[PDB]
Amino acid sequence: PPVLDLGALGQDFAADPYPTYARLRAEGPAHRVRTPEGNEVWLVVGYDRARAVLADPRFSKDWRNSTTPLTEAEAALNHNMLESDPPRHTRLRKLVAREFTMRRVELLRPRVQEIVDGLVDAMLAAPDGRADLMESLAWPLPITVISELLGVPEPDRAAFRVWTDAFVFPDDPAQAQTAMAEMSGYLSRLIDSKRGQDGEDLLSALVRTSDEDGSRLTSEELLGMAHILLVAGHETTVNLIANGMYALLSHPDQLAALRADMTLLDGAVEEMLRYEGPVESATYRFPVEPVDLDGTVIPAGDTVLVVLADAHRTPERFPDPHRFDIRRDTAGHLAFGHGIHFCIGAPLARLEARIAVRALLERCPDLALDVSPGELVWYPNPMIRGLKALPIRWRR
Ligand code: HEM
Numbered sequence: 001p002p003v004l005d006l007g008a009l010g011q012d013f014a015a016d017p018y019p020t021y022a023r024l025r026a027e028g029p030a031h032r033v034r035t036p037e038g039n040e041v042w043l044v045v046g047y048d049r050a051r052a053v054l055a056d057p058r059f060s061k062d063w064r065n066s067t068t069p070l071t072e073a074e075a076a077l078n079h080n081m082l083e084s085d086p087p088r089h090t091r092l093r094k095l096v097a098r099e100f101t102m103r104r105v106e107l108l109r110p111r112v113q114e115i116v117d118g119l120v121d122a123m124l125a126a127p128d129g130r131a132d133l134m135e136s137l138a139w140p141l142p143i144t145v146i147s148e149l150l151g152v153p154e155p156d157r158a159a160f161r162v163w164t165d166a167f168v169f170p171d172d173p174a175q176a177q178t179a180m181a182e183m184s185g186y187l188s189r190l191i192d193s194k195r196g197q198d199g200e201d202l203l204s205a206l207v208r209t210s211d212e213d214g215s216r217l218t219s220e221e222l223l224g225m226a227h228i229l230l231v232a233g234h235e236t237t238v239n240l241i242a243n244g245m246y247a248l249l250s251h252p253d254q255l256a257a258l259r260a261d262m263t264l265l266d267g268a269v270e271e272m273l274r275y276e277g278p279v280e281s282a283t284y285r286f287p288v289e290p291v292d293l294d295g296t297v298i299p300a301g302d303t304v305l306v307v308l309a310d311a312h313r314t315p316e317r318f319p320d321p322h323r324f325d326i327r328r329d330t331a332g333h334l335a336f337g338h339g340i341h342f343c344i345g346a347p348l349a350r351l352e353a354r355i356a357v358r359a360l361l362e363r364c365p366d367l368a369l370d371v372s373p374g375e376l377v378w379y380p381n382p383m384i385r386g387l388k389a390l391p392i393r394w395r396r
């Protein structure tokens with residue numbers, strides 16, 4: 001294949017990518033394509049292959065195995081679990097797994113609940129009963145929850161959305177590259193602000209751990225860590241809520257069910273993950289040796305992107321794919337990945353989302369999408385699945 005150019009494929013490829021992915025799936029598992037941003041990457045589509053690869057060791061996420069160059073501003077924060085393999089990935093993750101167990105996170109419900117609640121109160125405050133569920137709840141919830149955890153003074157949180165934006169499609173490649181340096185700068189400063197202040201938040205914990213013994217957690221790794229624990233639960237958990245809602249609000253029949261019975265909540269918040277999950281394609285993976293993806297051979301060092309979005313629509317795994325059913329069997333979706341890199345914060349995310357949906361359906365009479373689905377606009381970025389905004393309204 002000449003190599004499918006995603007860029008020149010319409011701002012609707014950001015809208016409904018699926019047909020393009022499926023079309024590829026039909027011809028084979030792997031495909032070379034140029035991303036809307038440029039660079040050459042491989043796309044692995046089709047559920048069975050997707051799941052498979054995610055856990056395949058031959059696909060290392062350690063940039064040392066990539067033949068793609070890394071700018072200095074990037075090289076800075078590339079010492080985290082999601083960008084390394086054993087033994088390093090093993091070593092690092094261990095450092096903070098106890099902080100994200102369903103049991104531990106559950107302890108945060110009281111707080112998370114209160115955080116959502118405060119946010120909803122302010123929403124219903126509007127006189128016309130119209131607000132953007134994005135800047136109104138979906139965005140502020142994640143960034144707060146996590147920021148109290150990692151210990152980010154609140155005034156400091158604004159610059160974060162700013163950067164994340166640049167990271168995702170920014171209106172200029174050199175601008176996002178600035179956001180990274182800027183962030184590294186902040187985090188590094190912040191890391192130090194903690195030293196000797198006997199704080200008990202996660203970050204303070206790590207700063208102590210790292211000092212006590214640098215062989216267990218290097219200074220770069222310390223940086224990388226704080227960075228990854230932050231920017232990995234953003235775009236994802238923030239769009240989870242948005243996508244989730246946009247999904248439930250554009251399928252009245254389903255909104256109805258959940259309204260009638262709220263026990264379907266957990267299972268509905270799951271189908272959201274399957275149907276319109278936040279991550280379109282898993283993060284970068286590089287073959288340590290050439291991999292023969294059935295007929296198609298991928299060179300060592302090339303960038304492989306497992307397309308979570310497509311596997312979720314592969315009809316041989318998920319019948320009536322494009323159908324948003326909250327009573328569906330969502331068992332086995334790749335929303336949070338598969339393998340050793342399986343989301344470390346799946347519990348924290350789920351909690352937030354579950355409390356978030358819960359709130360809305362409840363505290364919002366005649367809640368509804370405030371614009372037509374065709375009017376919404378998604379982010380061109382091929383690695384994410386987010387709405388520019390999500391208008392709504394409710395019985396004034
Ligand atoms: C809707 C929410 C979330 C989604 C969709 C999501 C999705 C994922 C996915 C797909 C991976 C694996 C990526 C890959 O292998 O390419 C992953 C990894 C990870 N996630 Fe999440 N995530 C979410 C929320 C969270 C939260 C709330 C945190 C932070 C507290 C978090 C922290 C991480 C980290 C640091 C990893 C590294 C895993 C490892 O390498 O062992 N995630 N997540």
Ligand SMILES: CC[C@H]1OC(=O)[C@H](C)[C@@H](O[C@@H]2O[C@H](C)C[C@H](N(C)C)[C@H]2O)[C@@H](C)C[C@@H](C)C(=O)/C=C/[C@H]1C
Nearest residue numbers: 074075077078167168228231232235282283383384
């Ligand atoms: C967990 C899935 C999302 O990706 C991420 O959370 C990671 C942290 C991040 O990718 C990293 O971004 C850094 C700024 C640079 C780093 N590079 C030095 C190696 C890179 O690996 C994303 C948050 C980037 C943004 C743009 C995004 O939208 C991610 C979506 C998920 C893949």
